[PDB]
Each structure stands twice: as structure tokens, then as C-alpha cells.
A paper describes a structure:
During activation of a pentameric ligand-gated ion channel (pLGIC), the binding of agonists promotes the opening of a selective ion conduction pore at a distance of more than 50 Å away from the binding sites. Each subunit consists of a predominantly β-stranded extracellular domain and an α-helical transmembrane pore, which interact via an extended interface.
For two cases, the [name] mutants [name] of the β6-β7 loop and Y258A of the M2-M3 loop, we have grown crystals and determined structures at 3.5 and 3.2 Å, respectively. Small structural differences in the vicinity of the respective mutations indicate local rearrangements of protein interactions due to the loss of the bulky aromatic side chains. The data suggests that the mutations, despite their severe phenotype on channel activation, have only a local effect on the protein structure. We have also investigated whether both mutants would at least show residual activity, and we have thus expressed them in X. laevis oocytes and HEK-293 cells and studied excised patches in the outside-out configuration upon fast application of agonist. Neither of the two mutants display ligand-induced channel activity in any of numerous independent recordings. In the background of the mutant R91A, both nonactivatable mutants [name] and Y258A bind agonist and antagonist with similar Keff as the single mutant R91A, thus emphasizing that the mutation has likely not affected ligand binding but instead interfered with channel activation. In both nonconducting conformations, the interactions with the C-terminal part of the M2-M3 loop with the β6-β7 linker remain intact, and the observed nonactivating phenotype of respective mutations ([name] and Y258A in [name] and F115A and Y250A in GLIC) could thus originate from an interruption of the coupling between the extracellular domain and the pore region.
Author numbering:
A (entry chain D), B (entry chain C), C (entry chain B), D (entry chain A), E (entry chain E): 11 to 283, 285 to 317
The structure:
């Protein structure tokens, strides 16, 4: 079995797409193994860059193809180099920018947390072993965090394991285990923008919707309630045109429904006050829910976190 | 005839575009046939990766070109390998990401169901036969489904058939039948998001439009109806800016039209009560349709499913 | 002159862009001509796929380059093959996906009709002739049409002509005519969606805008007219954010202006009745145009189709 | 010095991007120079297409690289050919589609005018001369213009000049002048759509804002003015979501501000009439600016063109 | 150590993406070093363009790979040339268009300032030195500035430094320092558009919201306040659909929140005047904050700049 040591440098993780569950990763990847010795031009180790690499492979040099399992399409590999040491060591260095996939749950959208994973396996060789993996996610941790969109929880955690592919050929008696490197980086979303510019104005509108009971006339309460209904629809539009569309209901999507229900229940209550015989307007209801309707919403919001 | 066995691994099916009738498919494709034996370097089977594959073809190696029929443009092939066995067997392994096309009907948009198909044929050889097809759609079935946007109904169905191309040359006496592998995967759309954040608020607004009859004055009924008219237009905007545009009317598109008619019919009814001579306001109409107008909408909605 | 027979198979025509006047075309293209006989490996005809074609050209094989005239950028060619017959025949088969250009007039947007054209010429040879062109647009005609966005009027029309390039060199005495194949496919847009989800609600809003005259007070008429003005502006937004933006006025764009004018003309009339001395409200005007204003709009709409 | 004659055929100029100052150009480019004679296979001139061109260069053929200066990234070259004449002439013909950059001023947006420029220089040779440039902009001038988005003013003007690159090496005594071909095509924007569907409804809304003074009550004037404020914001939204966003203020952007100012000045005037002691409502102001406020806007609009 | 002199020509810096912290850079890059002399064909220096460069490398020519550190994906290299002087000098000239990354803080959005940086290092050689760097950012400084979106503060500053990569192999005793060229260009955003078309109308809306206290009736004050609430939501939509979305709160985003608070505080004050026993309307409050509410906002705005 061949021993191959990898080193993955993460320069930047950006372009997080919660819908397609994808994220771009820019950086370098280095792999080193020890093979049969070689005569270098001059004793010092040789450097073979980019196009010259394939010429060495055509002459018989062994360079294994390592595939990112969870990658989304072939990544954009920049400069690539081979450092051939005379004692048999071979160091492959390559700059890459690629999009990777991992399951993402963002139902608690403003305060959700995800993990970015990378998975590396040899494409064709099972008789070759990844000896140790060292990541270098030296992006900042306490430089810009309150300003940045994501908060990395800490240095990445690595994991080398063996995967048993069952569905294979009929000629392998026992060789169906491959070496997989699985790196994981925990992260939490910065809720600053989504609190100040979305949850706060929603509360202001939802709270202002309860001030309909402080109007004197019954005719005044129903017509202004229709205007409040339009205002929630207007905010539901703004909150959906700017926020990323998603195939499931988020925390914010629920608050929008909550504002819809608050107003629709008000219209029923206003028409209700029917309730009394001979045209009495049940003024003890308008004044009671004048403060209870704000409280009933606050009581329902706490059971949302049950 | 040459016997070729295929195996298609589906990692992920994403990027479903109901408009262009396309969807992305990521995974691997393997093909195996037995040819003339060969002397390997060492007795064990050889592995030829990526750029080294074309060199063997230039020396005369036969590798048939397999084309995805329903593909949309040349797919993005990742790592490719040839495993040459000495006893004549040849295994072609390739990672691919490609966009495929199939007809999609989504008139019942929140509750529609589609199937994703793959169709594989040899590009130039009719005297060569695809012996058996095995798909490996080992994406989850009971892990994340309520959270996911699509619900796969179950393991994919395979189908090998023969296609008769009529319009061909004049030199083939009888050889105009090609072997087609047809994989089909059934799936149903997750209606959770589209119900809670779209159909539900639509019902609330449509219902609240009927509360115009609980107003006392005739002047009150017409002006608030214009506000209701504006409210439906505002919701038709939000529901069309976030939902995928389509060249036909969906279930939701029909509900939007229904809300328009409900309000316009109300404006006609409010003006109608006108009907009575000497300025009578036909108060038995306002109170009758106060509950009947909600019921007439429910009766028409049931005949929509006729 | 060399005789070259073409055959173009159209799988799918999608991605119609009325703005840039482009449309994607996926399918295969076949060309056959008879050249000097050849010794095949075995008597039967040879098949040369993909990378191996250029090797034969480097050894002197004549393969003419055929250019799509109206193409927009180099198309995406899939699998390509050469079928070399021993008696001299050569069959070139290639799968392609390309974007093509043709002038498009869509002023009658919901009910417009266009034609998709392809234009094929030899790139460098005028002393070579395209003998006959056969298209195979075997997309459905009676399968899905009401569900589909476009209605193909029928099988495509072919056309081989000669183009006289005047501005050329000074060494050709008379050879400046090239063979052009021009394929044309007629099509009509499916107006189902654009009628139900756009033209219909506009009429409802425009008609409901005429219900302002059934209000009793003069103060009531002006304020609801401003709400109607906002409603048309709101609909003008929705109709332009979802429909494709265009550099000219369509049928729908004219109706939008018509709703603007209807309301603006109403505001002038309401203020007019302012006209009468001593504060008379000209009640014979409000009631007359109560029905005439709908009719004047219908009368003006008929002269639009003049 | 080597004499090189160019000929540039412009099929279509589309995709004008006023923001990035870019525009797409599709067409052909031909270049001809006379070199050392050559032995052709057969006496007639040879045609070398696409991949075969590099083989002749590897054997020593001189083909100079001509670079588009104002290009934005490497263009998409279609088919390329070399016509080698035996008397030394060489004709290079290539189809290309590329994006070019040029400064664009569009402050008078609906009625602005621009020019599309091309600049061609040899990439490495200063001891080689571009003898004459002939453009073939045979796009229509009198076919479709009112229907088309841009109006080409007339046939393109050519211009060959010399550029003095100062910052160079230290080994060139005086050879720092290169030959530049500069083609310029004038064009004016079709204001039909932007007049009918934007400037016209803006005037309708702005004018209708002045009808607030024809209301009788002071309470009526302020509340409807707030509705007018919402209508302008709604139109400012519609006019900015469909029109191309720009980093400077256009003619339409100024009218939007003008509508904002008209309404805000009205709100100040309505509150003003606060001005009079003992609660007098200054009815001579409401009626004066009832027509003067429309006139003051018309007077301010004329000084905008000062 | 090899001495390498660079020269970087910047034609244009466009496509600034404050979200992804990226910006496109088009221009040329030149590098010159002196190596072992060579026999040129003729005494004068040779010019090797594009495809012919790799042929010289296959014959043993040393061309070091220089990588842009902060680049985002492989850049688009246009024409590339090698000027081989007989005395050993080698001049590499290449046209490039690439997107570069640098941290961007835009919290003071209309009046923020950024710097565009480029970072160049040899990819594999540490025993090679960049001797001096000369940038040529000869974009205008006094031509178009008020018209342009960004204001370049002045000529770029160069900086050659040494980077100590710690995490390296175990065979380098001390050679882990590479030569880095760091170019920096300061720039300030043109606030003309964002002031006239956004901050100005926002103040107009925010100020007009304070005119609610000049209404006479209490019922009038609350309902028009809801219309103002809808107007701010409408403007928050318009300002967020056109301005670039960002993961943090800007200057404009704070003003939007300020308008939200101004109105919600008004709704509380109107209901407050509850405050007085027996139904007194506290008219000394409505008139006091009639001017104080405008002043309290201005006082809060100054402490925003604290």
C-alpha cells in the first residue's frame, strides 16, 4: 500500500447557497508520497509546472487522480506543480476553486447553523492509503466577525475513514475499501442584518396592527384593518424578494403568517363586536383585547419555541 | 455483437427547472465489456486515468462513445478511468454532471408529480448490445423527506428497448435498430412551503374580502372593495415574483383569478343593491350574501376539481 | 464541384429570447459526400469517433467546415463521428446544441407568431455544392400543444439558394457564389397563460375603475380614483416584472396605458362636474358616463385593431 | 515593413450594457498580406481550416497575432481559415463574437446617443504596418428602425493612426510606434418604448397629484396627498426595477425626484393654508395654485434643459 | 537567485461586487529576467506568440509560473508573447482579465471607501527574486470623475515584501520565504446618485410623516399614520430591490429603520394624546411635537455620527 499525505489550505469560503445546498471553496491542495528514487537535473529537487506535468505522465510517471466526492462539477484548477525529490518523494501542489455540496437545514433562518464538509477519495486505487490529513483553515477567527456574514466556530475537524463499496465487480475477492478524508467546519450565521432590517420592522407592523382597537368607530376598525392587511402583504413581498427563496417555511416565514392571522382574527373580532342583542357593540371586548391581543400574540410566539 | 454492461450511480438530482423541462444529475457511470485479451504490465489489471486514456485509443484501443439522448449540451465529465483486465474485460469508469430534458406537466403546481428519465444509446454502433442496466439511486428514502423539496417514490425502474431509426442511409439492408437504456425515477413535489406561505395567506385575503358586506354604509362597501382589489393585485405580484414563472395556468394561478372575480362580483352586487325602486338598499341581499358569497366560492372551488 | 447531402435532426427548440432575438436548438447534423475510395480495415465501413477524427485530417483527409450563418457564438458540439465507406462515401454525424439568431416582431405579444431559421454555408469553399437538404423536425404536432408554450404550425420548409458575396478578393474572376441551406419553422405562441393571468385581471381592474361613478358624494369620487390610480400602477409593476421586458410597446403595454388614461380621464370628469353655475354638480353627467365611460373604452379598443 | 490589409464584417451589434460600458459584436474578420511565395499542392491556392493552422505554424509559418485593444476578455472565435496563395499572398479569415468596451454617457437616457468603437493593433510587431481598413457594416439602415432598439446614424468611419508607447524597454532606440485601426459607429437610442410606457404614465401621475387642490375640505387634501406620495414611490419602484440600474441620475430619475418635490411642496402648502389669523383657510391660495402648481412644474421643467 | 522585473498595466477596474468582495481587472502583465544567452534566427531578438510558447518549454525553456494570490479562479489570459533577446534577456508579455478578492467594509455605503489590491508571487520558486515592480494605472484622474462611479484617489502604491510560510516540508532547512508584490489602489465611491435618488426621497418621506400632527381630528391622525407605515415599507422595498443586498446594516438601512421608528412612535403618541382624564385630547402635545418630532429625529441623526 502507498502512503500519501495531504495538506489542504482554505483561503476563503464564500457563495453559500442554502437552496441548492452548495458553497464555493478557494484554496490549495498538496499531496506527498514516497516512490522509487529518480535522477534529477542537478542534485536538487526538480519543479515541473502545469503543461510539463502531462509530459512526465506520458513518460510513465505515476500521479494518482484524487476526486472530491461531494464536489459539484469539475472545479477550476489554477496552477499545478510537481516537486520531484531524488529520494523518491513527490509533492503535488495545486491551486483550486470548486463548489461543494452538503445537506443544509435552515428552518431557523436568522439563527441557523451549518457545517461545510470536504470529502476526498482516490478515484481508482483502493490499494493506496491516505496517511494523515492536515487542514489549514487560517481564515480569521477574531479579526472581523461581527462584520462578517458567517462565524466559524473554530479550526476544522478532520476524519480519515474507510468506505465499503458493496456494488462492485466480481473479480475483487476482498478489496472494496477506499480511504476517505472528511473535513468538517462548523459555522453560524450572523443574525445582525436579518434582525435589524427584517424582524424588527415586522414586529413594528404587527404591533401597530393591534392599535386598530384604539379607534372609536366600528366603521373605522374594519376599513383600517384592510389597510393593515395590505401592509402585511407588502412586507411579505419585501421579505421574500430580498431574502433567499426556500422550499420550506423559515422562522421569518412563520412570523409573516402570524401577522396574517393576527389581522384576520381582528376582522372576525371587530365584526363579532353583532354579538350583542339590540345592536350593543360589546365595548368590554374592544378594550379587553386592546391589550390582550398584543399579549395573545406574545403567548403564541413562546409556544413556537416549544 | 459486443455485450456491454452498464451501471449508473445517481448521487444527487437537483436544479429542477419546470419551465425549460430540465434537471441536473450528478453521479458516476460505468461500462464493462469483454474484448480481445491483452498483456498487462504485471499480471494484475491496469488502471488508465484521464489524459492517458486518449493515448491508448491512438494506439488502437476500442472505446465506444455512449451518448445521453435527452441531454442538454455536452455534460461535465470529471475523472475518467479505464480498468483493463488481461482476460479481455474492460471497465470504463467516469464521473459526470449533466443536464437532462424530459416533458413536465405542472398545472397542479403545489401537488404536481414528475419523473426524471435517463436515456443511453451507443453513438455509432448498432452491431453492439447493452446486456444489462443496474441503477444505484441510493439517495435517501427515509432520512430527510419532509425537509426535502422532492419525494422520490422508490427505487428507479430500468428498461432496455430497441429503437428503429427509419430515415438512414441506403447501404444498411436491415441494421437500423439501436439499443436504448431507459431509467425512470418517480418523484412528487413537497407542498409544505407552497401551502403555508402561499395558499394559506391567499385564503385569508380572499375570505377577508367577503367581510366587506359586514359594513353598514353603501359608500363604505365600494371604497374598501377597491382596497381589496389593490390587495389581491399586491398578492398576485408577490406570488408571481417568488414562484417560478410558467407558460400555463397552475392551481395557484387559478385561485388568484378567483379572488379577482370574487371582488369584482362584489362590486357588481354592492352597486346592484340601485336594484330596488325609490332608493331602497335591498338589505336582504347584503346580509344574504354576507354568508352566501363565502359559500358560492367554496362551491365553485369544488367544481374546479371536477 | 463536390456534392454534399445534409440531414438536420431537431430534437428540441427551447429558450426563446424575444429581446436578443435568439433561440437554442438541440439536435444532430449529418452530411454525406462521395470522395476518392479508400482501403478500410476489413471491407466494412470504418467508424471514427471524437478525438480520432483530427488524426485523419492531419494525415490529409478532407473534411470541409460548415458554418451556421445566423449562429450566436460557437455551439456546443457533443459526440462526432466519421463513417468512411470503402467506395469513397463519407458520412459525418454530429450532435450539437447552439443558439441561433433571427429577427423577431412581438408587438402583438400574447398572440404573436415567429419563425425559427437555420442558415448553413461552407466556410471557405465556393466550388462545392450542397445537393439536397432534409430536415427531420419530428417534435410533436398532435401530442402536447395546449399545454406547450409554442404551437409549431407544421413540418419545416427547406431552401437551398446561392449567395453572391460581392466584396471579395481580386483574384477570383467569377467564383463568389456560395451554397446556403436555409431551414424555416413556423410557430405561434400559446396565449392561454397570458390571457387568463394577465389580460383578464387587467379588464377587471379597468372595469372596476369605472365603478367609481356609482359613488354618491363628489369627495368620494376623487379619493377612490387615486386608489384606482395606485392599483393600475401596482398592476403595471406586476405585469412588467414577470413578462419579458421589451424595447417596444406590446398589446399588453397599450392596455396598461389605456387603464392609465381611463382613470386620468375620470379625474378630469369628476372635477368637471365645477362646470355648472352656482355649484350644481351636473348629476346628468355622472350617471351618463356611468355607462358611457365603459363604452367609450370599448369603442376606442376596437380602433386599436384598425 | 510588412503591409497587412484587414476587412471586418459586422453581422450584428447587440447586448449593449450601459453599466459596464460593454456591447457584443458578432461577425467576421479578414486580413491579407504578401509574403514569400510557396509551393502549393496543385497550383491553385490552398485552404487550411481550424486545427490544421497550428501545424503550419509549427513548421514555421508566420501568422501575426492581432489583438482587440478595447475587448473585454478573449473573444469566441468560430471557424478560422488560411488561404495561402502561391505568389506569396496569405488571407486569414475568421468568424468571431466578442465583447468590447467604450465609455458611454447616458444621462439623457431615453434620447441618448452612443458610438460603438473597435481598436485593432498587432500584439508584438511594430515593424509591420496595417495598410488599409475596410469595414462592412451592412446591417440595415432603412428596413426596421422604428421597430428596432437602436438607430445607426450611418456607415462606419475608419481611421488608422500611430500610437507612441513611451514606457517600454531600454533596447528600442526609436521603435515604439504601433499601427492602430479605429472603427467608430454612431447610434441613437429608440425612445418609443421609454416615452409611451414610462415618461407618459409619470406625467399622468404627476399631473394627477395637482388635482389634490380641487378637493373641498382641508382634511381631504392632506390624506389624499399621502396616497399620492405612495403612488410616486410605487412608480419610482416600477421605473427602477424594469429600467437598467445606473450609477448616475438620468432624465427619468430627475422626473421621479420632481414628482417627489411636487407632492412635498403641496403638503407644505396645504398645511400652510394655518397662515391666516383666526383659522381662515386662505381659499385664494388653494385655487391659485390649483392651476399655478401645474404651471410652476412646467416652468421648472424648461430650465432643466437650460 | 534570479532577478525578475515586473510591469503591470491596468486598463480598467470594473464589476465591483461589495457582497462577494470581488472586482474585475483587465490589463497586461510583463515580466523580464536575464538568463543564459541564446542563438536567435538572425541577430535581432525573437518573438514567440501563444501556441508556440509551449513548444519552446518542451525543448527545455524555463518560464516561471507567477500566480495572483488574491485571484478568484483562473483569469482569462488573452494574447501571450515571449521576447527572447540574444544576450539572455527574456520578456514575457501577456494580456489578462481576472477577478481579484479583497476585504471590503461598506457600512457607510453612500460614502464608503475601498482599495483594490493585487498580490503576485512565484508559484514554486523561492530561490527567485522579484527585483522591482512598476504599475501603470494610467486610467484617468482628471477627465471623468463626477460622471464615473468611483474616484481613484491617485497613482497606485507598490510594495515588495517577504512572506514566511511556516507549514512546509521537512527538507527545507531555511528556504521558506517567497517574494510577494503587493499593489494597492485607493478609491472612493461617487455618492451623487445615491444622494439624489435615495437619501433625498427618504428624507422627503420621513419629513412628510411628521405632517400627521397638523391634522385636526384624532381619527384622522391614526389612519393616515398607517398609510405612512405602508409608504415606508414601499420605500424599504424600492431601496432594497435596486441597491445591492448586503449581509450587514448600512447608512441607508439605518435611515429606513429610523423612518419605521418615527412612524411607530407617532402611532404611540397619537393614541397617548387617552393620557388626560375625562377625554381631554392634550392639544399642547400635538402642537408641541408638531415641531419637536422633526427636531428629535435630527438630534438622533447627529448622535448616529458620534
Amino acid at each position: 500500500p502507498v502512503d500519501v499525505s495531504v495538506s489542504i489550505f482554505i483561503n476563503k469560503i464564500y457563495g453559500v447557497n442554502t437552496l441548492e445546498q452548495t458553497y464555493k471553496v478557494d484554496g490549495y491542495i498538496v499531496a506527498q508520497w514516497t516512490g522509487k528514487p529518480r535522477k534529477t537535473p542537478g542534485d536538487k529537487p526538480l519543479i515541473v509546472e502545469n503543461t510539463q506535468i502531462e509530459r512526465w505522465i506520458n513518460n510513465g510517471l505515476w500521479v494518482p487522480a484524487l476526486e472530491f466526492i461531494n464536489v459539484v462539477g469539475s472545479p477550476d484548477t489554477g496552477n499545478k506543480r510537481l516537486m520531484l525529490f531524488p529520494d523518491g518523494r513527490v509533492i503535488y501542489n495545486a491551486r483550486f476553486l470548486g463548489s461543494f455540496s452538503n445537506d443544509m437545514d435552515a428552518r431557523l433562518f436568522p439563527f441557523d447553523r451549518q457545517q461545510f464538509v470536504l470529502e476526498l477519495e482516490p478515484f481508482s486505487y483502493n490499494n493506496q492509503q491516505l496517511r494523515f490529513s492536515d487542514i489549514q483553515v487560517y481564515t480569521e477567527n477574531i479579526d472581523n466577525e461581527e462584520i462578517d456574514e458567517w462565524w466559524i466556530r473554530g479550526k476544522a475537524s478532520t476524519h480519515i475513514s474507510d468506505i465499503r463499496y458493496d456494488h462492485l465487480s466480481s473479480v475483487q475477492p476482498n478489496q472494496n475499501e477506499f480511504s476517505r478524508i472528511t473535513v468538517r467546519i462548523d459555522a453560524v450565521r450572523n443574525p445582525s442584518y436579518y434582525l435589524w432590517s427584517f424582524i424588527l420592522p415586522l414586529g413594528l407592523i404587527i404591533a401597530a396592527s393591534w392599535s386598530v382597537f384604539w379607534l372609536e368607530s366600528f366603521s373605522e376598525r374594519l376599513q383600517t384593518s384592510f389597510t393593515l392587511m395590505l401592509t402585511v402583504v407588502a412586507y411579505a413581498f419585501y421579505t421574500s424578494n430580498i431574502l433567499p427563496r426556500l422550499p420550506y417555511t423559515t422562522v421569518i416565514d412563520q412570523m409573516i403568517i402570524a401577522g396574517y392571522g393576527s389581522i384576520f382574527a381582528a376582522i372576525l373580532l371587530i365584526i363579532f363586536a353583532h354579538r350583542q342583542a339590540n345592536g350593543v357593540e360589546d365595548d368590554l371586548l374592544i378594550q379587553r383585547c386592546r391589550l390582550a391581543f398584543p399579549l395573545g400574540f406574545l403567548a403564541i410566539g413562546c409556544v413556537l419555541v416549544i
